[PDB]
């Protein structure tokens, strides 16, 4: 993440078509932008909590479609079942977790990086 360059951000929310000056509640709200494709969303349109929003703004964040597994760097045939960390929004295939997961976790899920 420290190494891969960041795409030019699009200053429009892909979900509501507002800018940083107007979200769905007619209020200003800064965008977050995918580092790989540049497409953007308001945290409120992405349904991110304030805490998750703070963490992803400090990371090389990827949108839902661009998200690659932090362990294997792939999307692959099992991409749709990639888990998204509820602390940092990184993606992990279940088979790439440490330890590997046979089944979907229940409730909020925290990845191997965020776990103390």
């Amino acid at each position: 993440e420290k190494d891969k360059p960041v795409a030019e951000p699009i200053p429009i929310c892909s979900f509501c078509l507002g800018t940083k000056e107007q979200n769905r509640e007619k209020k200003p709200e800064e965008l977050i932008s995918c580092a790989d494709c540049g497409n953007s969303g308001h945290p409120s349109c992405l349904k991110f909590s304030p805490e998750l929003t703070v963490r992803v703004k400090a990371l090389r964040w990827q949108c839902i479609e661009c998200k690659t597994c932090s362990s294997c760097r792939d999307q692959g045939k099992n991409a749709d079942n990639m888990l998204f960390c509820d602390s940092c929004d990184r993606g992990f295939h279940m088979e790439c977790c440490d330890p590997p997961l046979t089944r979907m976790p229940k409730g909020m899920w925290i990845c191997q990086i965020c776990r103390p």
Binding site: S14, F15, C45, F84, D86
Partner: peptide, 25 residues
């Protein structure tokens, strides 16, 4: 937990791209 698939659904649809293009320029 969220997966790519469930996050697509729970987030809600993207706006029509033609409308995002009309706005992007």
């Amino acid at each position: 937990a969220r997966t790519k698939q469930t996050a697509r659904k729970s987030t809600g649809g993207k706006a029509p791209r033609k409308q995002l293009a009309t706005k992007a320029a």
